[PDB]
Short mmCIF file of C-alpha atoms and ligand atoms in Angstrom, two decimals:
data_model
loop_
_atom_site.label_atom_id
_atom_site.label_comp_id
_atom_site.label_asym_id
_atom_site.label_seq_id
_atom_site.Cartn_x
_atom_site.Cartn_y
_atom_site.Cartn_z
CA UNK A 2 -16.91 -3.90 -14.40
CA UNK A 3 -17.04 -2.92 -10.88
CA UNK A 4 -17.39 -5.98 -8.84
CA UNK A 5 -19.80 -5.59 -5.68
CA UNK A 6 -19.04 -7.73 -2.87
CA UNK A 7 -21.35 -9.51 -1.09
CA UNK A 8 -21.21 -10.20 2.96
CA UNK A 9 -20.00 -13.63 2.28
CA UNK A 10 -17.16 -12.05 0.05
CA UNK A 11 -16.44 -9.49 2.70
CA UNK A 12 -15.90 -11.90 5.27
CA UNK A 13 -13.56 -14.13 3.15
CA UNK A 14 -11.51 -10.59 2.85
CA UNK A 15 -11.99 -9.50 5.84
CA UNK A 16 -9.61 -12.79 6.80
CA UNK A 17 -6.94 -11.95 3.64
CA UNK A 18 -7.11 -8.48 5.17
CA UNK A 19 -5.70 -9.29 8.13
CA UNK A 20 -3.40 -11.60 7.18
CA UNK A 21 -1.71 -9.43 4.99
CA UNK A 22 -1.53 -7.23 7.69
CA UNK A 23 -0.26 -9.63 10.28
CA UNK A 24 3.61 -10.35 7.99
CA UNK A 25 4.06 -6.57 8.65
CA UNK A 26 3.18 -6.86 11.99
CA UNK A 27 5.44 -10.07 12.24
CA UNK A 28 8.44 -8.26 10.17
CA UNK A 29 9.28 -5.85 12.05
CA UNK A 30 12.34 -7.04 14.45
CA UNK A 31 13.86 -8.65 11.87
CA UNK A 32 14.03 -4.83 9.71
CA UNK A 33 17.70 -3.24 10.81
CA UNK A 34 21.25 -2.98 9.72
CA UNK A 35 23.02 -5.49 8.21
CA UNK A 36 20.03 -7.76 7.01
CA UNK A 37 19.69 -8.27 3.40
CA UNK A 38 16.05 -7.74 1.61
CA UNK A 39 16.24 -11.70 0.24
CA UNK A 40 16.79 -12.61 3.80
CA UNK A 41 13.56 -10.60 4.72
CA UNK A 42 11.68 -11.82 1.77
CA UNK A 43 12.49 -15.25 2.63
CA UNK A 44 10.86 -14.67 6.31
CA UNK A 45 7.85 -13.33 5.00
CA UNK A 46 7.08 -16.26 2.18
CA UNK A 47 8.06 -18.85 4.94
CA UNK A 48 5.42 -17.24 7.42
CA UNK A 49 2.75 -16.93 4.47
CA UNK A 50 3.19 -20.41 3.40
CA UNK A 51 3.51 -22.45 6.69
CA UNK A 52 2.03 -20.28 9.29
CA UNK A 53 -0.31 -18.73 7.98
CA UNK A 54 -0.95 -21.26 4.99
CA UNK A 55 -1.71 -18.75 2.40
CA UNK A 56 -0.12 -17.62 -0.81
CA UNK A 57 1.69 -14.61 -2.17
CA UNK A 58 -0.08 -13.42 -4.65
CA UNK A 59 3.05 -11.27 -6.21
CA UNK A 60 5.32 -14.71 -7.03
CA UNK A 61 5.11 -15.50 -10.58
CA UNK A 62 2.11 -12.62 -11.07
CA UNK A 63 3.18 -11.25 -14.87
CA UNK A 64 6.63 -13.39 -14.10
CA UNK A 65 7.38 -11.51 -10.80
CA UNK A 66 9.99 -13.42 -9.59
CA UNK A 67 9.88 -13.08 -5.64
CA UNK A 68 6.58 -13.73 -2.77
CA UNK A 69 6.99 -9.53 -1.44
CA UNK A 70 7.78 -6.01 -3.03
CA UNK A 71 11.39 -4.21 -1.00
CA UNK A 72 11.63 -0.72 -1.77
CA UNK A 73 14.15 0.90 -0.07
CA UNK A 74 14.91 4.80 -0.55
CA UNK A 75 14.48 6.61 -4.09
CA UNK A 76 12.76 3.07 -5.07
CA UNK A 77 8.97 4.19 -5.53
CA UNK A 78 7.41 0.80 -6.09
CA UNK A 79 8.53 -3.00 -7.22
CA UNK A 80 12.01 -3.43 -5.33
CA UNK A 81 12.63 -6.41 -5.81
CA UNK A 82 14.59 -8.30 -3.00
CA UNK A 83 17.93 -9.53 -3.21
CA UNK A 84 20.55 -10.97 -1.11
CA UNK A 85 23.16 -8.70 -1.74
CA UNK A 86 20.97 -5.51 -0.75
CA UNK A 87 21.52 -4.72 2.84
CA UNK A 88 19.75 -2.39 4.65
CA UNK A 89 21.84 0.72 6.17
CA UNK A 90 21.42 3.37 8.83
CA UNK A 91 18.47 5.64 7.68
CA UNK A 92 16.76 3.90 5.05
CA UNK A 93 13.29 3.87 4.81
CA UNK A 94 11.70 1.23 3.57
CA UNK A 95 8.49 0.13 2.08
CA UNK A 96 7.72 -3.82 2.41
CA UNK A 97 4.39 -4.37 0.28
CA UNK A 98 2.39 -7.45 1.17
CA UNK A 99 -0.29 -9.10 -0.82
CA UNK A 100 -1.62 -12.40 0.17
CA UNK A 101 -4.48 -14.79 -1.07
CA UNK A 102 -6.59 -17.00 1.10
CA UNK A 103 -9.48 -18.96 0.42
CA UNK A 104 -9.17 -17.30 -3.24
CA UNK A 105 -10.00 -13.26 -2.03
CA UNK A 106 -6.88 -11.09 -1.59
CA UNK A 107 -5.51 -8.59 0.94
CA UNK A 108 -3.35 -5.87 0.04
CA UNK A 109 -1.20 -3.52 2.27
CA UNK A 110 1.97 -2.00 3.17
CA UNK A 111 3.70 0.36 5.19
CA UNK A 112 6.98 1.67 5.57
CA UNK A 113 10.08 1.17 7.92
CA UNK A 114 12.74 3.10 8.93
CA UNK A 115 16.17 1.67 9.78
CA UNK A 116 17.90 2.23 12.85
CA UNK A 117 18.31 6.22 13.16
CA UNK A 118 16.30 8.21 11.00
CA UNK A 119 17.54 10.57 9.13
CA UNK A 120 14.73 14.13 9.22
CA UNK A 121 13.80 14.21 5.75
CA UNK A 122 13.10 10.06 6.02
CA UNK A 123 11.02 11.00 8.99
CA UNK A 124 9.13 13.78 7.72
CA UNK A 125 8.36 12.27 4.69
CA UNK A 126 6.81 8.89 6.22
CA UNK A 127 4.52 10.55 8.54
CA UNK A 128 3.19 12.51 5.67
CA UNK A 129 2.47 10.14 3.84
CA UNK A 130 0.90 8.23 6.45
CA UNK A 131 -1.31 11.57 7.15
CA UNK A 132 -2.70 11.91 3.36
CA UNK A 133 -3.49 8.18 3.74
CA UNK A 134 -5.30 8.91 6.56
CA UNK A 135 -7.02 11.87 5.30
CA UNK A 136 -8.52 9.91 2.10
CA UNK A 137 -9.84 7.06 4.48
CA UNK A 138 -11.81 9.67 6.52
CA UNK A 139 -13.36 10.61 3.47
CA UNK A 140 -14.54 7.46 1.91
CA UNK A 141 -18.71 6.94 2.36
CA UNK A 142 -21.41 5.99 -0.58
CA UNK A 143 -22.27 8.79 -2.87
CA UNK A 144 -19.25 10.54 -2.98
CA UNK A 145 -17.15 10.58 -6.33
CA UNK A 146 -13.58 9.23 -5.87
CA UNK A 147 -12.02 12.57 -7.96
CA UNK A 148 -12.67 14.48 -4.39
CA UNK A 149 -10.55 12.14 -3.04
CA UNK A 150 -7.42 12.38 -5.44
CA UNK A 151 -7.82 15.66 -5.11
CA UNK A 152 -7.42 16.03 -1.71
CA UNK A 153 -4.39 13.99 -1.11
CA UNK A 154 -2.50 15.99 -4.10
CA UNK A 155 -3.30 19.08 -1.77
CA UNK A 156 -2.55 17.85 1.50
CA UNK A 157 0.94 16.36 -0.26
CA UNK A 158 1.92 19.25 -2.29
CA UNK A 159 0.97 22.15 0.38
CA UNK A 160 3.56 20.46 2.31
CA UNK A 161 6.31 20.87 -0.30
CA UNK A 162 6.26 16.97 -1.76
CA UNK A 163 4.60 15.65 -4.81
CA UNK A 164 2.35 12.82 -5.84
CA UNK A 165 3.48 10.13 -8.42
CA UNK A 166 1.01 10.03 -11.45
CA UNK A 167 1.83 6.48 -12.82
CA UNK A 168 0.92 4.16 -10.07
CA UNK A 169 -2.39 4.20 -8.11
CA UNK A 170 -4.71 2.66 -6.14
CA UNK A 171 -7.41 -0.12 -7.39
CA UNK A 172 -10.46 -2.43 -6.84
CA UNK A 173 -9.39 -5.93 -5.54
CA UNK A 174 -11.23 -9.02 -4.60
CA UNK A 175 -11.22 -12.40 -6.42
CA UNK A 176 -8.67 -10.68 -8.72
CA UNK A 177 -5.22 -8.56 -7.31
CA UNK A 178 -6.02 -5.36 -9.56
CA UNK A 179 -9.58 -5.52 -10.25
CA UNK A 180 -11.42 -2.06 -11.35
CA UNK A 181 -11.54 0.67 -10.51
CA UNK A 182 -8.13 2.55 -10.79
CA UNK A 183 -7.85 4.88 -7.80
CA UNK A 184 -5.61 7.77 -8.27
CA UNK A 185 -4.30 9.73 -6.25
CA UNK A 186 -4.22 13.13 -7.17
CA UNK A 187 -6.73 15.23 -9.09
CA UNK A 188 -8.09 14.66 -12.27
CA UNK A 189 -10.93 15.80 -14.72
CA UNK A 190 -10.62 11.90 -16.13
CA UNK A 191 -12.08 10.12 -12.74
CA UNK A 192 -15.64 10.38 -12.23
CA UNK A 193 -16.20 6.52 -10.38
CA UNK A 194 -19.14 7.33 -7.17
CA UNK A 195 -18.79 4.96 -4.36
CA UNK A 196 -21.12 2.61 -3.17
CA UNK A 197 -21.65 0.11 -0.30
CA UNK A 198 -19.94 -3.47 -1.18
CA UNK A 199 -16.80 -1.86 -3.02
CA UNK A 200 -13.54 -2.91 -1.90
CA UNK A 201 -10.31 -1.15 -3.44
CA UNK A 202 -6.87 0.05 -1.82
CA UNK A 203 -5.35 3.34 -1.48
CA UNK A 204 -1.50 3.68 -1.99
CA UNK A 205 -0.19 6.75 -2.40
CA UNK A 206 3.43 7.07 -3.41
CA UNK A 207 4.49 10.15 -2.54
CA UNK A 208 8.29 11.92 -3.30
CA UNK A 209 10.37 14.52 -1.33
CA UNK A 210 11.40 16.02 -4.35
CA UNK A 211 9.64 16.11 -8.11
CA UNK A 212 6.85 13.83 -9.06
CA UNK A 213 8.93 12.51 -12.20
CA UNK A 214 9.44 8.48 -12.35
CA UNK A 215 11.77 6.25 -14.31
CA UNK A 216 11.31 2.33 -14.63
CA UNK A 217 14.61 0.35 -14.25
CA UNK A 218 16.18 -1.94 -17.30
CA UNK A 219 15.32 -4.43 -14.86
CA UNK A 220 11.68 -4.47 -16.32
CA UNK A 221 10.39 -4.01 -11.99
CA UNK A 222 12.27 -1.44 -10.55
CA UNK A 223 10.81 2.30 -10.35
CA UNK A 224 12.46 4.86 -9.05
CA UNK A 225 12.44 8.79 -8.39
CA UNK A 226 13.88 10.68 -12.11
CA UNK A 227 15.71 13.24 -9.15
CA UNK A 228 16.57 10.38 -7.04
CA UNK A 229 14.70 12.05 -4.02
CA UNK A 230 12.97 9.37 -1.47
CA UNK A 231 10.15 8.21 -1.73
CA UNK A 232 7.39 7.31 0.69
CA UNK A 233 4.31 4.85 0.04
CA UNK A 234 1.59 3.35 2.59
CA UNK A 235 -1.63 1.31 2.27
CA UNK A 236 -4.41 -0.27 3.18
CA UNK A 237 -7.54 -2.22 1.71
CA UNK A 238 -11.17 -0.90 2.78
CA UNK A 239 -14.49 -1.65 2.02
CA UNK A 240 -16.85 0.91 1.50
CA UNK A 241 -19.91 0.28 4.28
CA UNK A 242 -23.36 2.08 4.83
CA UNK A 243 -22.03 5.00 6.37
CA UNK A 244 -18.60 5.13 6.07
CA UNK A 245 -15.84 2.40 5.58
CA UNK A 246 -14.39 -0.26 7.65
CA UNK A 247 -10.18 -0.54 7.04
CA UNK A 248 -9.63 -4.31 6.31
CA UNK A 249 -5.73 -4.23 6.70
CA UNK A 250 -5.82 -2.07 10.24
CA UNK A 251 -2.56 -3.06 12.14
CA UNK A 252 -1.53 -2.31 15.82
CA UNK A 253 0.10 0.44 15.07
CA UNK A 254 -2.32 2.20 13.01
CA UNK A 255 -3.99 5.18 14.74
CA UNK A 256 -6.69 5.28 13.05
CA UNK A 257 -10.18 3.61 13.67
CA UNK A 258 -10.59 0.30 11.63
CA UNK A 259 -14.56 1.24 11.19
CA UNK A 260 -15.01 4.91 10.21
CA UNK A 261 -18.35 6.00 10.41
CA UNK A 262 -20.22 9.28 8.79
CA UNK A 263 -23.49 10.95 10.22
CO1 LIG B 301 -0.65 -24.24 11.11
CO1 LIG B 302 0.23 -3.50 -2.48
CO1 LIG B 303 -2.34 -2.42 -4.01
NA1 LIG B 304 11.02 4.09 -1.11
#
């Protein structure tokens, strides 16, 4: 069941959408050495609750135990934060955000590096970034979402990382994960075409070394089998007329927030 927004809905996530995007823009100085990811989940949750009186959608979703998702290094997805995990010289780190207001969610996240960057931490962030990019300036009605799987995979692998099969994008709205699964490499399984009023996220998680992924005995935790790092950004769109308009655009993205075909 792929749920089609209407304008009303798309207004209600237009205002999640930004939200969301507004704890990473709020985060930020408080990401260096020495602070602990509890402290910095703690700051987030405070700003989502009494600020910005929203809710986290991740607390207590399937038992999930804290309001944010840390992932720092070889963690590919579902750090969770802790006070006795402090952040170091180098690190990169992905802080993944999804808040609910007025019952529609927004989704995004983005990552951070820590004091001096190291060259592979670098490298690896900005491609990532990049085959974000690239699917969002593909996205329009008509086209089949394969293409775009496909096309990050390329973009990744051609400059010598890989994709991770396991986790992927997906539709949200009224519901966090909502249909349809949006993967992010190529596959002979996805055949979904877009069309106006469909609003999903793309989050590709992308490794310096091999693609292979273990989960943690910690039941959250994944991280790289080769212990490479590992590099994930996204955003939440809604596909439009002509193109698609980015509903988690911060200041610091460089990309348009309405991308438009013709
Ligand atoms: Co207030
Ligand atoms: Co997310
Ligand atoms: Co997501
Ligand atoms: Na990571």
């Amino acid at each position: 069941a792929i749920s089609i927004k209407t304008p009303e809905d798309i207004e209600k996530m237009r205002v999640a959408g930004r939200l969301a995007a507004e704890v990473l823009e709020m985060i930020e100085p408080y990401v260096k050495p020495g602070v602990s990811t509890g402290e910095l989940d703690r700051i987030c949750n405070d700003y989502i609750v009494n600020e910005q009186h929203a809710v986290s959608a991740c607390l207590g979703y399937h038992g999930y135990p804290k309001s944010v998702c840390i992932s720092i290094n070889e963690v590919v997805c579902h750090g969770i934060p802790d006070d006795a995990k402090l952040l170091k010289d180098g690190d990169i780190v992905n802080i993944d955000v999804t808040v609910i207001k007025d019952g529609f969610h927004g989704d995004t996240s983005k990552m951070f590096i820590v004091g001096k960057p190291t060259i592979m931490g670098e490298r690896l962030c900005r491609i990532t970034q990049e085959s974000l990019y690239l699917a969002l300036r593909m996205v329009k009605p008509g086209i089949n979402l394969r293409e775009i799987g496909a096309a990050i995979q390329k973009f990744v692998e051609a400059e010598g990382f890989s994709v991770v099969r396991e986790y992927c994008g997906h539709g949200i709205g009224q519901g966090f994960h909502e249909e349809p699964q949006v993967l992010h490499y190529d596959s002979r399984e996805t055949n979904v075409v877009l069309k106006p009023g469909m609003t999903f996220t793309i989050e590709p998680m992308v490794n310096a070394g091999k693609k292979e992924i273990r989960t943690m005995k910690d039941g959250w935790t994944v991280k790289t089998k080769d212990r490479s790092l590992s590099a994930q950004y996204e955003h939440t769109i809604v596909v439009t007329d002509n193109g698609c308009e980015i509903l988690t655009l911060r200041k610091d993205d460089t990309i348009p927030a309405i991308i438009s075909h013709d």
